[PDB]
Subunit: 247 residues, 7 copies
């Protein structure tokens, strides 16, 4: 789960705890990453719905234009290709929490649909006129200023406010450098756990080399550098020579 | 309908006058929930009080189903119409219908609405049969309709038919005396909905709310208030709990 | 029907001249409902007064059904033609038809109308059978048709055939002596259809109406009047009850 | 038909009398009007085919793009809409005269078909390979300088030469003011005769008022002014006040 | 057939006699005129195929884009409208001569099909894979510089050289004035014979009037002026007064 | 058969003899002509695949976009028009040599297919997924610089290197004047033999006229001049007067 | 593999360290045969050396069958699919697949590829059934992927998945000590597949080959070599047989 050390991150987890015990929609802003989903589950496991299902969907990763079809579901013959009936992600997240990752990639028409789901607390599959009563807690993320996206006319203003009741800005890695070392060691361990290998120590100069890199790719880039260093050290003591950043 | 500003009370005074009549009411101003509740205020003060109240947001209907929802359709009137379905005008029989954000209707859809208003009857899509209509019409626009007409995006004849009695529900910053009662209203109905006790708002917090221009109006006030309730852990809302934009 | 201005009376005097005949009357001037009441006046003053009077607005028919309603259509003449249907020309047999806003016809629709006027025959879309017509034709336009012809949007041959006896029904500000009698008529017919006793207008209210340029003409006057009746609560309309966009 | 008095118009009828005796194609030039057809009928009744049929078609007045279909005819199913077999206008004008009014409205493809009709003296209906022998004399009109229209590439040069064997330019009404008074009297007469009314006289001042108007609408406009004067005079003596022109 | 008198034309006919005796493809260039296809016929009847068929097709006059279908022929159903099988123009000109008039109107694809016909000396109908063996001599014309047309990418270079073995340029009427008087008389004769009328002569003053006109329409215009003159002269002797030129 | 005399031409035939013994792909460059095919035929007859089939296809002469269809072949119903099965040019060239004349006319997709054919030594018809083992030597031509064509992104680089293993640039006729006279005589020869005529000689002055013309049309243009001269001389002695160049 | 240049030897040394793992390898540099020779080296040095090795060039598949051949497809999944067909991933089960020139995939194919890497399972086109995959992934680009991501033509998330262990296989001029061993190698395999004795390369020819920049790299060297063998009549290759760009 969430492993931090920087004071700004600790403050952000503190806020995450306050909103967790409620049913408010959480908007996780900041650069795109995987932490956002690490917090989403954290919020879930801290919410009164910890035993409920946790469903995640990335609105910027679904090919063949099946974002709409995945969210709301569809009946047999709702569109060219719909060979079967299929429950939406909202249905699978009944009594639990759904995560709409990268929500800023929804077209204006899809937002108008999503708005109705939030308002009516009911969902209807594509090609269906039957509504489904919904008890689902909604989380969402965005790597861009939604307020300006509303101004640009690419996002609904009404939907914007309904989702920004409790925004949390999960910052880049360079703005929380105290998180780098705990995160680095965490990646080393979980990768050693995959292969039954003992976790190796990490050199001081290696750490200093990591702390002083701006990390434009954030956690995703850190995971690469670490995994790369583990290859170089052959799962052994990693030193500054094993740390190859874009420098 | 929670108001307190003297200019808002004047507006409710006008609303009480048209309520007694069957006149088309156009509620102007910025988009919001108020235009929706001020329309239902009129209904409950109208001779059609006990009648049905139908609302439709022309800027919120997905899949281009605005026309199909208003007038209804017969089976197979368009690709996807797998059943018969009455229009919102039919559902508003003997009562009131609200055409929220009416400026979103295309010129063709305006021509159909015009026919409905003048002939007091409606026809479903893919239907030749007219249905006699006894419906009081309310509408809403966040645009200057006259400027919209002159821009050639709105029918002039339809404009005058809907603009016999325009009420302009202003922005929240030009009716600041409504802000404190509104906030307490928003807190209450949110707490009641969640089965929680209603907290009060500290004097400093009120001052903080009154001096914000509210570019998002009521929709933003509900935001701030719901956020404050989370920060206050459902306790009394202090100035520290009110985050506006920074 | 309800005029008092000397230039309006002189126009109705001209209306009686053509009424006796079967000549095509072109009614020019601002887009209004007043044009239809004069065309009714022409009909009721014509030897076809006992015949039918059918009106059609060429700028108010949705779903591109202007051609379909004028000429009629057989079953399956177009995708949607689910039945046979007589045109507006057939219904006006032995009487008078009013082609309101005739400047909205596409050049192709004009060529078909020209065919009807010349041969005194009509044929439904889908049909090759022509129907002998005995119909007197009236038309309107808020547009300089001569200018429209030069702009290549209107047929020159059709123009001259309809411009035998052009009558220009002027704007409301160019016939202000009609304003006061018209205002009382709008009050009377509105109150009567709502079962309310008819109120009169205060002198100050009259002067206020006479000195407004009326960019919306009779359509706008009806708005202001109905608005005043709401404000006056069906009492005597005072100067304060008259809210125009000054 | 025909009512002239101007010296330049009398010469033009004199020319019409010469081609009438022949089978030559006549191109009637000048501004569009009814006079174009009444001279075509004058030629026909002065022609050896005077007992033959006279067929007229306005190429600029046939709706639904039925120009080609009306001229050549069509068998059942030649195009989407052909629910029957139908003879062409050329077939109807067999042994007589056909009038192609405003011929400059034909597309270059339609011209190519008309060309082969003039050359081979045969016509084929749309959707038919069966050719029909034709004994038809051809007349045509145009409000356009066909030579300029040829040079512009909108008209076939070869067709231009077959049709402009004997051009006759029926001028604007202002270039033949001596025709105005006889023409006005003709209109007053035929209207009153159509209603069984006695023909009224026309004041000298009314005549002079008509003579000094340029008539941009030519004969078509004159007919309007005359009718309007009859309406105003109540079929009575037309005076210099029943003549409403422009102002 | 050929009615010439100018030494310029006589030298061309002299050249025509040489190729006639051979099977070489003749390219007749010069302004578009009926004049050519008289030479094409002269070439044919002076050729060893004088008893064979003579088929002429004008590539710029075939309506409804039926150039390719009439030249190659089709089987039933080769295109929308083909309700039967139909031999091409090449098949009809078997053992004789075919004339491809205005060959510069063929699109690059049609040209590629014609090229293959010249090489393989066999043709296949549209919608047909069976190839018909041919023994046809090919003649062609063009009113434009084919070389320039090749450089403009509107004509195949290989096809150009196959057809331009023996190019004969049939000049404008003004560049061979001594042909005018004999041509004029021939146009009067064949027109007067066509209508069963006695053929008249042309006055000397009328002759000189014809000789000093540049003839931009060439012999299509000369045939026009003549037919118009015969109308005015009432089939009598043509005087200069009867000759109305466009100038 | 290759008839040359220029020292630069003899060098290319010397090179051609070296590759003929091998199985390498030969790219013949220079202006488009027929001499490129008679070199392919030469290379074939000098190759160990001499007795094998020689199949030639011009990629710039196949109408109706049937280039891809004729090369690879197709099964019944591979495209709208494929009414039967049909073997490709590669199949017909089994155990022999194929000539891809003007290969620069292949679209990038068709090039990617040809590349696979060269690599895997297999071909499959359109609409078929069964592949056919190939034993075919590939020769190709191009009237343009393939390197610039690759740089222009209109030709695959990898394919360019597979085809330009042994490029031979067959120059224009002006860069090898010593070939003109032997070529011209050869043309006079074979053009006589097809008619059963005795071969005539060509005057010294006439030869000199040939040598000093730049021949922008090369061999194709030379053949025209020769044929034209034979027509003018009536298959007799050719003099400088019979030689009409574009001058 | 040939290799003699210190640069290439260090790259192969790095290849050995990543071979023993299941990490995705990114082989960068100009397009050539050498990339797949390294991808095969990585395989034969990996614990999956006895497993299947599947190669697919994303820039060489005709008729847009890149997505189809990679993922596989059920019958009639697209207009052309007349049969079921397993994808390249299915064929590379328990072994290694090489996605050659991966920068040619469109953003959609990249999204599909991403899910395959994440979930370690694939589903054919027109199929809902997911196939569990034990497949090691190698990839190749002749393009700066980082820049390609910034240009918005490549997914950033997919980029970092593949950029765990990037290896840049340089141009032939940046590793000249490989030229001579590579040259003799190309002669050897070309002569052996043609049933000819292998010729040697003269000292003067070697230096002539060493001082050419090789913009076409190995593909050009193989080209130049094969041409030399023809000129040498399969004899020893002299500098006179080396035709480059003179």
């Amino acid at each position: 789960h969430m492993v931090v050390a920087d004071t700004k991150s600790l403050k952000l987890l503190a806020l995450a705890d306050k909103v967790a015990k409620t049913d408010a929609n959480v908007m996780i802003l900041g650069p795109s990453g995987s932490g956002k989903e690490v917090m989403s589950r954290y919020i879930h496991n801290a919410s009164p719905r910890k035993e409920g299902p946790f469903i995640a969907i990335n609105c910027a990763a679904i090919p063949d234009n099946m974002l709409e079809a995945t969210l709301f579901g569809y009946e047999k013959g709702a569109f060219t290709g719909a060979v079967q009936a299929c429950p939406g992600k909202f249905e699978q997240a009944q009594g639990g929490t759904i995560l709409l990752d990268e929500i800023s990639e929804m077209d204006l028409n899809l937002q108008a649909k999503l708005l109705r789901v939030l308002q009516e607390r009911e969902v209807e599959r594509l090609g269906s006129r039957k509504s489904i009563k919904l008890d689902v807690r909604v989380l969402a993320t965005s790597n861009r200023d939604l307020k300006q996206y509303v101004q640009a006319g690419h996002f609904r203003e009404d939907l914007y406010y309904r989702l920004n009741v409790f925004p949390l800005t999960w910052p880049a890695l360079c703005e929380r450098k105290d998180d780098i070392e705990p995160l680095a060691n965490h990646l080393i361990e979980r990768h050693c756990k995959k292969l039954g290998l003992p976790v190796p120590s990490i050199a001081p100069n290696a750490i200093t080399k990591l702390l002083n890199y701006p990390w434009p790719g954030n956690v995703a880039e850190l995971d690469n550098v670490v995994q790369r260093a583990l290859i170089l050290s052959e799962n052994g003591h990693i030193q500054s020579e094993h740390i190859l950043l874009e420098g």
